[PDB]
Amino acid sequence: ITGRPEWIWLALGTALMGLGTLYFLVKGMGVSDPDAKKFYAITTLVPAIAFTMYLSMLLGYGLTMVPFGGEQNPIYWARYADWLFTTPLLLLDLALLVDADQGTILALVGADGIMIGTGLVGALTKVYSYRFVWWAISTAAMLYILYVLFFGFTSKAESMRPEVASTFKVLRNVTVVLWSAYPVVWLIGSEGAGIVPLNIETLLFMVLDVSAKVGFGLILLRSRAIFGEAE
Amino acid sequence: ITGRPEWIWLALGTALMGLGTLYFLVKGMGVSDPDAKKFYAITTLVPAIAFTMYLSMLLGYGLTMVPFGGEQNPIYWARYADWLFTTPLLLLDLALLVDADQGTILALVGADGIMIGTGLVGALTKVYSYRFVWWAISTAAMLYILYVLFFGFTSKAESMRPEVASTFKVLRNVTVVLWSAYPVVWLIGSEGAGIVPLNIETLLFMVLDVSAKVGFGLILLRSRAIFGEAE
Amino acid sequence: ITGRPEWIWLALGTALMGLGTLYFLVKGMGVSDPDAKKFYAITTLVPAIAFTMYLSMLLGYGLTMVPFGGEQNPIYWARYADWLFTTPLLLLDLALLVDADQGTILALVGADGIMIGTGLVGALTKVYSYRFVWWAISTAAMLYILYVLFFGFTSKAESMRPEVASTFKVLRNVTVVLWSAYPVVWLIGSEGAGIVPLNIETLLFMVLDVSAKVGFGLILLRSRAIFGEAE
Ligand SMILES: CC(C)CCC[C@@H](C)CCC[C@@H](C)CCC[C@@H](C)CCOC[C@@H](CO)OCC[C@H](C)CCC[C@H](C)CCC[C@H](C)CCCC(C)C
Ligand SMILES: CC(C)CCC[C@@H](C)CCC[C@@H](C)CCC[C@@H](C)CCOC[C@@H](CO)OCC[C@H](C)CCC[C@H](C)CCC[C@H](C)CCCC(C)C
Ligand SMILES: CC(C)CCC[C@@H](C)CCC[C@@H](C)CCC[C@@H](C)CCOC[C@@H](CO)OCC[C@H](C)CCC[C@H](C)CCC[C@H](C)CCCC(C)C
Ligand SMILES: *C/C=C(C)/C=C/C=C(C)/C=C/C1=C(C)CCCC1(C)C
Ligand SMILES: *C/C=C(C)/C=C/C=C(C)/C=C/C1=C(C)CCCC1(C)C
Ligand SMILES: *C/C=C(C)/C=C/C=C(C)/C=C/C1=C(C)CCCC1(C)C
Ligand SMILES: CCCCCCCCCCCCCCC
Ligand SMILES: CCCCCCCCCCCCCCC
Ligand SMILES: CCCCCCCCCCCCCCC
Ligand SMILES: CCCCCCCCCCCCCC
Ligand SMILES: CCCCCCCCCCCCCC
Ligand SMILES: CCCCCCCCCCCCCC
Ligand SMILES: CCCCCCCCCCCCC
Ligand SMILES: CCCCCCCCCCCCC
Ligand SMILES: CCCCCCCCCCCCC
Ligand SMILES: CCCCCCCCCCC
Ligand SMILES: CCCCCCCCCCC
Ligand SMILES: CCCCCCCCCCC
Ligand SMILES: CCCCCCCCCCC
Ligand SMILES: CCCCCCCCCC
Ligand SMILES: CCCCCCCCCC
Ligand SMILES: CCCCCCCCCC
Ligand SMILES: CCCCCCCCC
Ligand SMILES: CCCCCCCCC
Ligand SMILES: CCCCCCCCC
Ligand SMILES: CCCCCCCC
Ligand SMILES: CCCCCCCC
Ligand SMILES: CCCCCCCC
Ligand SMILES: CCCCCCCC
Ligand SMILES: CCCCCCCC
Ligand SMILES: CCCCCCCC
Ligand SMILES: CCCCCCCC
Ligand SMILES: CCCCCCCC
Ligand SMILES: CCCCCCCC
């Protein structure tokens, strides 16, 4: 395990996701409100899935070698397995907060699936120049998602409770900033142009992942917006 | 890319799915009705997914070699990845049109999953005679789906709005004819008996795919059946 | 096929799932009640999926070799493909019976996904001692599911119809006993410590699978709890 310099960040990531999972699990024990239960379920599952995939990367299972540029390049494929399930759960948290219509939710989840799926294909593609074609398609799917979060959701939040409108606005802003960093790190890291070494890349993704999951969850689950308006 | 004679049909397929995706995306921009949004979301996602998988076939990612009959046989596995997601979306379009009950929808999607999954296993099976066992099981799942579309849905459409009944009937008929061709092409093509060469097989699937997705979508999204009855 | 001593149990399993599938399919033909249709759909799909995966194991497709302990160890990976889809369907049968809230259903299905997914990783892991780390995480996800079935569902059933409360209690008890045997068989069988040989392991899983699917389904589909209260 320690044979890879990036192991320290995989281990820290595993620990922080594990701790985040346990914290949300305990916190949600005292919850009976049916609406709050939905948000706790979604939000606890996110770091639990990430915990398993960080562990698989730490132990070496979630790593494969991909030939491109005349080299055997270490590619952590387990990231995409994580993201396939956790990024639509994160979007679902946002969509339920603002009572999004079903068509909009399906558009978001579908675009998200395309985003992660094409990122996976790009990560595993052996023809170097083609990796960036997949990156571009994935990034276009991301831009669609960000567009919807701003010009379909923000003006939906404003007709809702003030506490859900303010909580949505904060989580929207956190999401757009954090999620936009992922394609940049991929592009300059070992999957793309290879300018930033894998150990630093792994650190960067770990900070983004913990912030986008445990950070996000801490903000959401401390808000009164997750509860039905009750006396 | 041009090293494979079937590349021209993969390229045309990619282009037509891409163009179809953009057309539906633009067309649905001016839509606020919650019901119509569902149909636009579902129907736009279908060629978008197909676009990505056609591209993966064009670039060579979605192709593998399978030993059977003492030969290395080129198998485009990306078709099944496409179909796994797009065929239940197509069925969902039909089921929502007639306000199908939840049990019926689950039966359809489940049978569809079995249909595509067993087709994939058959496509990748190395014992030649066993490929046709999987083809038979998949075809039985197809026949179940077609049965339900006729003797569970058609008489559901007739108690609904005339515009939804007439639109459903047309899309049902398009679906049954087009979908029934797929097992025949598989059986006589490079996956099955090998009587029709891969380049012609690829052409045939491209015509079926564009018709079943973009053709289907053009009929559906031009109907007033996708809108709630409103003043 | 007969080259593997466990083939007889794979063949019997295939037959019993096939027969169970046909029986439930015929039985549900005379059903119009929308609630009952849901239970028939879910419950018929379960042995149908299991039939396909038992067949893939019989024909040899669903088997791979995994190096650990200095040996090539036969691992039937198709079990996890089965279980990935059938165990959440089984939980859905239980959850719908007691009209579980959406948050609880998502927690169950999510924990179940983690349970099966980590079992799959453990089954395919090449470092022997690490296989048991994945077994432990999977078992913890199982224990969560069993906890919810007892201390979240049982007291939900009691405020419902007596026929649904009594049917739920029986199916809950069947589920907890049968499902708890699976991690034990894995641990002592060819995936784990290797004390029980593969042919006996295969027998054990076949008895558990038929009981947990066809047995379970026979109890559920003969109950009046699956019908809406109607005059
Ligand atoms: C509604 C939304 C969910 C829409 C989803 C959007 C989605 C369509 C976007 C594209 C997804 C698609 C790229 C998934 C591809 C998975 C694939 C990378 C798995 C690895 O297999 C690739 C090659 C080795 O590189 O296998 C070597 C050759 C092997 C023989 C491969 C044969 C097995 C195939 C992988 C079977 C395909 C199954 C499905 C792709 C399962 C989807 C997995 C998940 C990653 C989407
Ligand atoms: C409700 C509905 C959805 C019901 C669904 C119906 C469904 C049950 C029908 C059968 C689906 C099942 C056949 C999927 C099999 C996928 C498999 C072909 C992927 C390729 O792996 C096959 C061999 C190489 O040929 O791998 C070589 C050996 C490797 C070590 C394989 C180990 C990895 C396994 C593939 C893990 C299994 C994961 C699940 C099958 C994911 C499902 C993928 C999708 C195609 C259904
Ligand atoms: C809401 C709930 C559903 C939550 C779900 C919980 C879930 C997160 C729990 C963990 C699931 C995760 C372990 C699935 C891993 C599948 C993996 C074993 C498939 C086989 O690939 C493993 C190695 C060979 O051993 O591939 C060799 C290297 C290859 C290059 C691998 C590259 C292809 C990757 C497999 C692509 C990943 C796609 C997704 C994992 C699809 C999920 C399949 C299913 C088994 C969950
Ligand atoms: C918890 C993990 C999260 C929130 C991950 C988010 C990841 C993305 C938004 C990834 C986006 C990518 C692209 C837009 C193109 C390049 C490849 C990706 C997959 C890194
Ligand atoms: C957009 C793509 C569509 C509508 C594809 C439909 C495909 C089928 C109905 C495929 C059916 C098959 C069988 C019935 C058995 C042989 C294998 C298949 C998968 C080709
Ligand atoms: C129809 C099949 C059923 C009901 C299978 C149930 C399987 C399980 C509950 C498996 C549990 C496992 C663990 C808890 C850890 C070890 C690995 C598994 C996957 C066997
Ligand atoms: C969105 C953030 C992307 C920028 C990442 C900056 C990383 C700077 C680290 C120094 C680069 C290491 C190069 C020498 C090894
Ligand atoms: C459902 C349509 C299946 C029939 C396809 C007919 C294809 C005819 C093309 C000629 C066959 C090529 C054989 C000589 C290369
Ligand atoms: C939950 C049941 C697990 C116990 C399984 C008992 C199997 C006993 C069979 C005898 C073991 C075979 C060892 C000699 C080959
Ligand atoms: C490819 C995996 C996509 C599914 C991820 C799980 C999250 C799905 C959330 C469903 C949202 C509800 C839509 C109506
Ligand atoms: C194996 C992939 C199956 C899922 C495909 C996505 C479409 C699912 C549509 C869900 C229909 C709603 C059922 C209640
Ligand atoms: C990884 C596969 C998980 C999906 C299995 C299919 C069963 C899903 C049942 C959905 C229950 C409804 C939740 C709201
Ligand atoms: C186009 C929608 C406006 C809100 C999205 C902001 C786009 C940020 C760009 C992210 C950088 C990705 C490379
Ligand atoms: C049995 C249901 C009647 C409607 C379905 C028509 C079946 C068409 C056969 C398709 C050919 C597949 C090989
Ligand atoms: C902790 C919840 C109480 C009900 C679950 C009973 C646990 C049975 C243990 C199963 C054995 C697995 C190794
Ligand atoms: C070796 C790099 C070749 C450049 C490929 C860039 C493709 C980016 C596509 C953006 C439309
Ligand atoms: C080499 C071909 C052997 C014939 C197999 C046909 C099987 C079809 C099954 C239909 C019930
Ligand atoms: C396994 C193929 C089944 C096709 C005939 C339909 C059987 C009746 C089902 C009624 C829902
Ligand atoms: C070779 C076996 C080494 C023992 C591993 C047991 C790990 C079990 C983890 C339970 C917390
Ligand atoms: C509760 C702490 C969980 C941390 C387990 C994984 C950390 C890796 C240590 C090497
Ligand atoms: C908008 C046109 C999209 C076409 C891109 C793929 C066509 C392949 C050209 C070689
Ligand atoms: C209807 C009987 C189904 C049995 C088919 C599979 C049994 C395997 C026989 C070798
Ligand atoms: C993006 C950083 C999130 C910070 C989380 C802090 C949570 C405290 C309530
Ligand atoms: C099956 C062929 C479909 C033809 C689509 C034409 C759409 C025009 C409205
Ligand atoms: C766990 C054993 C189940 C027994 C099923 C018998 C069904 C008869 C109604
Ligand atoms: C990591 C366990 C958290 C302890 C409880 C925190 C207050 C709910
Ligand atoms: C008003 C919300 C500001 C949140 C910005 C957080 C940036 C990481
Ligand atoms: C809305 C601001 C987006 C900031 C992008 C930051 C990418 C590192
Ligand atoms: C391909 C872009 C379509 C242009 C608009 C067509 C009329 C909505
Ligand atoms: C009355 C609907 C006829 C549609 C037939 C289309 C055949 C491709
Ligand atoms: C309902 C008519 C089906 C026609 C099947 C055509 C197959 C090529
Ligand atoms: C296996 C076929 C079952 C025959 C009908 C049983 C009574 C519904
Ligand atoms: C009162 C229900 C008892 C069911 C026990 C079944 C054990 C297999
Ligand atoms: C509730 C009793 C569980 C029995 C476990 C049996 C495991 C073989």
Q: Indicate whether residue C23 lines ligand 22 (CB < 6 A).
A: no
Instruction: Ligand 3, residue C80: give the atom nearest the CA.
Output: 45
Output phi, psi for B158, to 5 deg.
Answer: -70, -20
Give the burial class of A1: count Cβ atoms within 10 A of its Cβ; 0-12 exposed, 13-18 middle, 19 or more buried. Answer: exposed
**Structure-determination approach:** X-ray
User: Quick one: tokens of C207?
Assistant: 């008895």
Given a contact cutoff of 8 angstroms between Cβ atoms, the answer to whether A39 and A226 are in contact is yes
User: What Rg do the C-alpha atoms of chain A give, in angstroms?
Assistant: 18
Torsional class of A196: left (φ above 0), alpha (ψ -120 to 50), beta (otherwise): beta
Mutation pick for ligand 17 pocket among B127, B128, B129, B132 (CB with most ligand atoms within 8 Å): B132
Residue with tokens 């485009």: B76
Closest by CA position to A108, among listed B23, B41, C106: B41
Rounded Cα distance, A98 and C145, in Å: 30
Name subunits touching B (3+ CB pairs < 8 A).
A, C
Sign of CA dihedral A65, A66, A68, A70: positive
Output phi, psi for A68, to 5 deg.
Answer: -155, 155
Rounded Cα distance, C6 and C77, in Å: 15
Question: Which one-letter amino acid corresponds to residue A39?
Answer: F
**Which positions in chain C touch B130 (Cβ < 8 Å)?**
59, 61
- The neighbour count for residue B48, using CB atoms within 10 Å, is 24
Mutation pick for ligand 33 pocket among C172, C173, C214 (CB with most ligand atoms within 8 Å): C173
DSSP code of residue C224: G
Given a contact cutoff of 8 angstroms between Cβ atoms, the answer to whether B94 and B223 are in contact is no
- The neighbour count for residue A154, using CB atoms within 10 Å, is 15
> Across the interface, do C104 and A56 touch by the CB < 8 Å criterion?
no
* Segment (H or E) for B181: helix B162-188
Torsion angle of alpha carbons A200, A205, A208, A214, nearest 10°? -120
Given a contact cutoff of 8 angstroms between Cβ atoms, the answer to whether B45 and A106 are in contact is yes
DSSP string, A11-29: HHHHHHHHHHHHHHHHHTT
Report CA A68 to chain centroid distance, whole Å.
Answer: 27
Task: For chain C, positions 107-166, list CB contacts with chain B under 8 A.
Answer: none
Closest by CA position to B167, among listed B219, B211, B230: B219
Rounded Cα distance, A6 and A58, in Å: 9
Given a contact cutoff of 8 angstroms between Cβ atoms, the answer to whether C16 and C8 are in contact is no
Q: Cα of B41 to ligand 24 centre, how many Å?
A: 19
Cα atoms found within 13 Å of the Cα of residue B45, Cβ hemisphere only: 29
Ligand nearest to the CA of C141: 6
User: Quick one: tokens of C219?
Assistant: 């109890």
Closest by CA position to C185, among listed C172, C173, C171, C203: C203
Q: Cα of C98 to ligand 21 centre, how many Å?
A: 52
Q: Find the closest chain B residue to A138 by CA distance.
A: B52
User: How many cross-chain Cβ pairs, A to C, lie less than 8 Å apart?
Assistant: 47
* Segment (H or E) for B63: strand B63-68
Q: Find the closest chain C residue to B140 by CA distance.
A: C48
Rounded Cα distance, C183 and C83, in Å: 13
Q: Cα of C138 to ligand 3 centre, how many Å?
A: 15
Rounded Cα distance, A39 and B156, in Å: 36
Q: Which CATH superfamily is domain B1-231 in?
A: Rhodopsin 7-helix transmembrane proteins (1.20.1070.10)
Torsion angle of alpha carbons B210, B214, B215, B220, nearest 10°? 150
User: Quick one: tokens of C149?
Assistant: 């079935």
Closest by CA position to C210, among listed C22, C8, C46: C46
Given a contact cutoff of 8 angstroms between Cβ atoms, the answer to whether B7 and B41 are in contact is no
Nearest-CA distance from A127 to chain C in Å? 29
Q: Angle CA(C168)–CA(C14)–CA(B143) in degrees, nearest 5?
A: 85
Q: Which sequence spans correspond to the domains of chain C?
A: 1-231
Resolution (A): 1.8
Nearest-CA distance from C189 to chain B in Å? 27
CB contact C40 to B (< 8 Å): yes
DSSP string, A103-159: HHHHHHHHHHHHHHHHHHHHHH-SSHHHHHHHHHHHHHHHHHHHHHHHHTSHHHHTT
